[PDB]
Amino acid sequence: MTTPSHLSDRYELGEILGFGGMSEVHLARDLRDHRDVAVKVLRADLARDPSFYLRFRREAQNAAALNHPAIVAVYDTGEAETPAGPLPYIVMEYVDGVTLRDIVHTEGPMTPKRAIEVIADACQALNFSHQNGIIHRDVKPANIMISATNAVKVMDFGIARAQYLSPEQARGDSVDARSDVYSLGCVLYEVLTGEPPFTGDSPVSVAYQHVREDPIPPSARHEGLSADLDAVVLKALAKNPENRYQTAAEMRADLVRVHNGEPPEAPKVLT
Numbered sequence: 001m002t003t004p005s006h007l008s009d010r011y012e013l014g015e016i017l018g019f020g021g022m023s024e025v026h027l028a029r030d031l032r033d034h035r036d037v038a039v040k041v042l043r044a045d046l047a048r049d050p051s052f053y054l055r056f057r058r059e060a061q062n063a064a065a066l067n068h069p070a071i072v073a074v075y076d077t078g079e080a081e082t083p084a085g086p087l088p089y090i091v092m093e094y095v096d097g098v099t100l101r102d103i104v105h106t107e108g109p110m111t112p113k114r115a116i117e118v119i120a121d122a123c124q125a126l127n128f129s130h131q132n133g134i135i136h137r138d139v140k141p142a143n144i145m146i147s148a149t150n151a152v153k154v155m156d157f158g159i160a161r162a163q164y165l166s167p168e169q170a171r172g173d174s175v176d177a178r179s180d181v182y183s184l185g186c187v188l189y190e191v192l193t194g195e196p197p198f199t200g201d202s203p204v205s206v207a208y209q210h211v212r213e214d215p216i217p218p219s220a221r222h223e224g225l226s227a228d229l230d231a232v233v234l235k236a237l238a239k240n241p242e243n244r245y246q247t248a249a250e251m252r253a254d255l256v257r258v259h260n261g262e263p264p265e266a267p268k269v270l271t
């Protein structure tokens, strides 16, 4: 079962780049604009499943389109008619790079300074989104890439539908910029320690832990991590949104302090 060689007459597919729970991403040439793009398409094997067809249209295809250097731009969406059936797709900015999920998997924890740099840049992407009224809602290692020229790129903003969810998302409360802060804190935790804050035999077990259980401070999970870093990470991961960083920009400012070896403003954490 293949994905067609073309999507409309416009997009000529090249190499496969990646795949996920519901889609496959291909490098493509836009023949109209002479541009290499990434085309995300419903996976060829799941393509006959109505439940996935629906998810793809309602979720993947609804990624918000934002113009920022740290955000993967969304160019186009559509549906190709395939001998098998209608095949939905979304066209976006091509990133020659690797997701943070892959980096952690293949290389282990990032050095602390590199981790701070990467997450500080993610904060800029989130600030821009928030300033433009969009909550990301699904910040996770899989939604952040680093390019071959070391630029951070954040993707797949503003979609509806456990390792990275905020307590409020677990509870069905209001989700806001502070929920994105929390979830980015989880990512930061994971790139520093090599492990996410909470692991469980199920998503309900992980959700429970987000609501109810204190994360182990990063310096307890892994060597070379300071108490200043514990302080920043543990603030982003506060259960009560009022005790977290209130904005992505407030979080970034403490990251930049720690990068420059200045004390963060986050409450001290002792171990």
Ligand SMILES: Nc1ncnc2c1ncn2[C@@H]1O[C@H](COP(=O)(O)OP(=O)(O)OP(O)(O)=S)[C@@H](O)[C@H]1O
Pocket: 017, 018, 019, 020, 021, 022, 023, 024, 025, 038, 040, 060, 072, 092, 093, 094, 095, 096, 097, 099, 142, 155, 156
């Ligand atoms: N902008 C893009 N440029 C290059 N590669 C990309 C791009 N977007 C996605 N990829 C690659 O394609 C893979 C799959 O994309 P995802 O968005 O994770 O798939 P998905 O099935 O829509 O996601 P979920 O959240 O698993 S359902 C990623 O891990 C990347 O390797």
